[PDB]
Write a protein that binds this ligand. Structure first.
Ligand SMILES: [Cl-]
Ligand SMILES: [Cl-]
Ligand SMILES: [Cl-]
Ligand SMILES: [K+]
Ligand SMILES: [Mg+2]
Ligand SMILES: [Mg+2]
Ligand SMILES: [Mg+2]
Ligand SMILES: [Mg+2]
Ligand SMILES: [Mg+2]
Ligand SMILES: [Mg+2]
Ligand SMILES: [Mg+2]
Ligand SMILES: [Mg+2]
Ligand SMILES: [Mg+2]
Ligand SMILES: [Mg+2]
Ligand SMILES: [Mg+2]
Ligand SMILES: [Mg+2]
Ligand SMILES: [Mg+2]
Ligand SMILES: [Mg+2]
Ligand SMILES: [Mg+2]
Ligand SMILES: [Mg+2]
Ligand SMILES: [Mg+2]
Ligand SMILES: [Mg+2]
Ligand SMILES: [Mg+2]
Ligand code: NA
Ligand code: NA
Ligand code: NA
Ligand code: NA
Ligand code: NA
Ligand code: NA
Ligand code: NA
Ligand code: NA
Ligand code: NA
Ligand code: NA
Ligand code: NA
Ligand SMILES: [Sr+2]
Ligand SMILES: [Sr+2]
Ligand SMILES: [Sr+2]
Ligand SMILES: [Sr+2]
Ligand SMILES: [Sr+2]
Ligand SMILES: [Sr+2]
Ligand SMILES: [Sr+2]
Ligand SMILES: [Sr+2]
Ligand SMILES: [Sr+2]
Ligand SMILES: [Sr+2]
Lengths: 119, 237, 194, 46
RNA sequence: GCUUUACUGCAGGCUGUCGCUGAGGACUCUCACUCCGGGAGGAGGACACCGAUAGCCGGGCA
RNA sequence: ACUCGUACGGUCACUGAAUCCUGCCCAGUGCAGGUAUCUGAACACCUCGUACAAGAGGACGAAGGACCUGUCAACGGCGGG
RNA sequence: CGCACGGAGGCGAAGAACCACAGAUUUCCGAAUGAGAAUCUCUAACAAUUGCUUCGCGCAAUGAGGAACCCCGAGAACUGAAACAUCUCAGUAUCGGGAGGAACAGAAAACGCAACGUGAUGUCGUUAGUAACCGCGAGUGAACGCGAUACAGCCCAAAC
């Protein structure tokens, strides 16, 4: 909420998570805030995911601005457990990143473009 | 020295407490959701041990039985009303806004919904003076002009039992019996009649206060006795 | 490159600036309505917790404790006292609020032992600290190479004896040289002059 | 006064403790109850 | 033990200042905070309370 | 605590039923109110000083005091010539 | 066949008594824990607070004691200063909390015989009534080092 500045529609989120699953089964993904943060810094992040139900918020606060001064696009997910399941984890995940997608390059690109229009 | 009587008071020991367990009811304005729709019948008139004045037992339409701070002229059988659209008759309770100016009121609220604070003793009453969209001015029994929220509820009429103060106690026994019903230590020994150790005015070979009686507001407890921050004293001038 | 943790750390270097400021103003409202000791699922400051020995593991607990701000709540003398000993107002306690916080927490969890604690801010009348506690009886910890040291009998009630880091710090044991003459090996052994 | 079952057991013990050192103990030990209590002269507990 | 314009201090009261504490020399506001209200909600409001310090009074007490 | 109390109350004091009455004094002391001007601490601010600091000075000035007024059914006073 | 030498009687070569180790039994109150109570009572009990958790008291923890010693907190006054306020008595007496068989401390953001030097920590001897404090009064009072004792050095957080 303090780091969230734009609302992502449920349908748009569905598109994003579906793309994440195929991204792990084809390309490559990073699970967990630490790994996600390094991707944004190293430049290998194509699309980063950030959960909105993170408590404490400190854990993710930095993403929305780190991704900006690195030109990396990000999208907000409503639930931490859905992001983790999409990434293929039994547990939840505060943040994940698509490091080089796979057969989702078109979808991801569009999703990234849709977010820009959504402010 | 030793702590003065005023200090023993604050400890709230048995001697200084009021016989609450003997008290009847915390006479507060009945709560109503809205719309005003609420009335009751006076079932009886009782003596209130805490105020030495009469109190009306009232049974409401919803079945609630509660003692009420009775104004003068209320009797068994009478129908009392409480709400925004209540009838402007003695015994009824409605916000100061709905109460026409120039009309005597009692048991006035200080903050809307508190249940009544001002003008509750025998015979007293507050005078509702000015209306407004923001404030209703009332003249309390002390003569002070009190600006209040027009939403503050109040009962119409003067409190019952007026004139109680007109008859003298005559003898100590009568005072004794009244005192026994209040949170007060009685009788009263004059400070000047005590030993120096017991009170600032104590000591001396003859009875007279040590220094002058008018004490500063800033005086600490144990010393604040006599004429507390008096703006003047005596009768002349 | 930088750890995600380093960002939580950097944010907390100035709890009155940026997002953290907004966050604190919001949380403190909820904290003021909470109890004295409140167990919490996750540390408010991950970097600090982990840095202090915390682990997302069974037997590791965290609790936020609030203690009143200010000097000693002292009762004035009721018998003869020389002017030096007649004070009340300016007297301060020798244990710091963080240490009081740690103890109040340890008492709430009789079976757990205090591992460490850290500050999470303060309003105008109280301070909050989050204490990391450990269950010395859970096998998850009895087998943890990094934490099983706290399972030793001599670590029982370590907070009440000042064995905590904040405890040792408050006992004036930081310096190994000059200034620590009356503090090491213990305040009591040095006649209580530390 | 009203005695409870326990008070009564103690009073009972106190009364039996008030017995004399049996005749045989004198012979066996080749020669005194230091706890000889009297209802009037002495005073029990409780 | 007691007294006081004895000496020296310590509580306590009053008062300024810092923190809590925010938006647009006097003022508006609401979001912290306080109170009223079962509640919805109302009043108050960056004051008050509380923490800290400074000046004044201070046989109430040592 | 007072208080299931709200000035026809309750707190703090003095005097001490009734009856006839209760003069004069506000300079000192107390209390309270006001106050142009004077005095009045700390923080912040300005000058000097110190590559910083200690420190010196300045500006502003709260309650309080000066000053003014009210008050004796306040403490008390009611003489010499 | 206790202290304890009596009377009656009994036990022991089926090896008793007696001693060592191990085990059985082990009423009621008691931290006292189902609830209450001056050691009893009433109708299934980890009461209370916690951790784990099959979220069920299922598996666990705490409580109280102990001669002093130990560690963390609160903290006098008589007294000395030929009075007394800072100072002193003294961080003493006493109080709150807590561990162990010992505690605490401990592998340098050290020392500073200033070095081309020492090398975790306690403790003992000394340094020394020295430096330092103090109505610079009365009084108060270290450390580095040195000689010894015993010696021991490691693990995380993060980077990846
Ligand atoms: Cl009366
Ligand atoms: Cl502990
Ligand atoms: Cl050396
Ligand atoms: K002394
Ligand atoms: Mg009432
Ligand atoms: Mg009268
Ligand atoms: Mg009474
Ligand atoms: Mg009298
Ligand atoms: Mg007398
Ligand atoms: Mg006498
Ligand atoms: Mg006195
Ligand atoms: Mg007289
Ligand atoms: Mg007199
Ligand atoms: Mg030792
Ligand atoms: Mg017999
Ligand atoms: Mg309230
Ligand atoms: Mg005295
Ligand atoms: Mg008389
Ligand atoms: Mg029981
Ligand atoms: Mg002396
Ligand atoms: Mg001398
Ligand atoms: Mg000393
Ligand atoms: Mg040294
Ligand atoms: Na504990
Ligand atoms: Na010291
Ligand atoms: Na007897
Ligand atoms: Na005496
Ligand atoms: Na005068
Ligand atoms: Na046994
Ligand atoms: Na148990
Ligand atoms: Na259970
Ligand atoms: Na002497
Ligand atoms: Na003397
Ligand atoms: Na001195
Ligand atoms: Sr989770
Ligand atoms: Sr009321
Ligand atoms: Sr009420
Ligand atoms: Sr007198
Ligand atoms: Sr007159
Ligand atoms: Sr324990
Ligand atoms: Sr007798
Ligand atoms: Sr008379
Ligand atoms: Sr005067
Ligand atoms: Sr060594």
């Amino acid at each position: 909420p303090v780091y969230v500045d734009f609302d992502v529609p449920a349908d748009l989120e569905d598109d994003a998570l579906e793309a994440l699953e195929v991204a792990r089964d084809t390309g490559a993904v990073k699970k967990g805030t630490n790994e996600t943060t390094k991707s944004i810094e190293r430049g290998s992040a194509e699309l980063v995911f950030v959960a909105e139900d993170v408590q404490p918020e400190e854990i993710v606060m930095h993403i929305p601005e780190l991704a900006d001064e690195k030109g990396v696009p990000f999208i907000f997910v409503e639930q931490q457990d859905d992001l983790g399941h999409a990434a293929g984890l039994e547990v939840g995940s505060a943040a994940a990143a698509v490091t080089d997608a796979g057969e989702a390059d078109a979808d991801v690109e569009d999703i990234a473009d849709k977010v820009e229009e959504l402010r | 020295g030793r702590r003065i009587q005023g200090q023993r008071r604050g400890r709230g020991t048995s001697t200084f407490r009021a016989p609450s367990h003997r008290y009847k009811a915390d006479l507060e304005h009945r709560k109503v959701e809205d719309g005003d729709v609420i009335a009751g019948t006076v079932v009886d008139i009782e003596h209130d041990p805490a105020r030495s004045a009469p109190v009306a037992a009232v049974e409401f339409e919803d079945g609630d039985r509660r003692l009420i701070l009775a104004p003068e002229g209320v009797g068994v059988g009478d129908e009392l009303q409480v709400g925004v659209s209540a009838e402007i008759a003695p015994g009824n309770t409605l916000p100061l806004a709905e109460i026409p100016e120039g009309v005597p009121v009692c048991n006035v609220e200080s903050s809307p919904g508190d249940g009544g604070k001002f003008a509750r003793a025998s015979g007293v009453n507050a005078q509702l003076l000015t209306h407004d969209r923001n404030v209703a001015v009332v003249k309390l029994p002390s003569g002070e002009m009190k600006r209040l929220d027009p939403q503050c509820r109040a009962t119409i009429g003067v409190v019952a039992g007026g004139g109680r103060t007109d008859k003298p106690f005559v003898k100590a026994g009568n005072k004794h019996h009244k005192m026994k019903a209040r949170g007060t230590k009685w009788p009263n020994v004059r400070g000047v009649a005590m030993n120096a150790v017991d009170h600032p005015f104590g000591g001396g070979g003859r009875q007279h206060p040590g220094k002058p009686k008018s004490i500063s507001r800033n005086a600490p407890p144990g010393r604040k006795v006599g004429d507390i921050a008096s703006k003047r004293t005596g009768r002349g001038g | 490159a930088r750890s995600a943790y380093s960002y939580i750390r950097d944010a907390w270097k100035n709890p009155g600036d940026g997002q953290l400021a907004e966050l604190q103003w919001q949380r403190q409202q909820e904290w003021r309505n909470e109890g004295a000791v409140e167990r919490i699922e996750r540390p408010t400051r991950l970097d600090k917790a982990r840095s202090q020995g915390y682990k997302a593991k069974q037997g590791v607990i965290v609790a936020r404790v609030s203690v009143r701000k200010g000097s000693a709540r002292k009762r004035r003398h009721k018998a003869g006292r020389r002017s030096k000993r007649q004070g009340v107002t300016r007297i301060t306690r020798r244990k710091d609020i963080q240490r009081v916080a740690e103890e109040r927490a340890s008492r709430t969890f009789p079976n757990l032992r205090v591992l460490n604690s850290y500050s999470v801010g303060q309003d105008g009348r109280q301070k909050w600290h989050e204490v990391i506690l450990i269950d010395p009886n859970h096998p998850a910890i009895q087998n943890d190479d990094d934490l099983s040291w706290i399972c030793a009998d001599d670590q029982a009630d370590r907070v009440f004896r000042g064995l905590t880091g904040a405890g040792r710090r408050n006992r004036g044991l930081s310096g190994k040289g000059k200034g620590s003459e009356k503090t090491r090996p213990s305040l009591r052994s040095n006649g209580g002059k530390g | 006064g009203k005695k409870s079952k326990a008070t009564k057991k103690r009073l009972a013990k106190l009364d039996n403790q008030n017995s004399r050192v049996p005749a045989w103990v004198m012979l066996k030990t080749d020669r005194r109850n230091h706890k000889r209590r009297h209802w009037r002269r002495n005073d029990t507990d409780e």
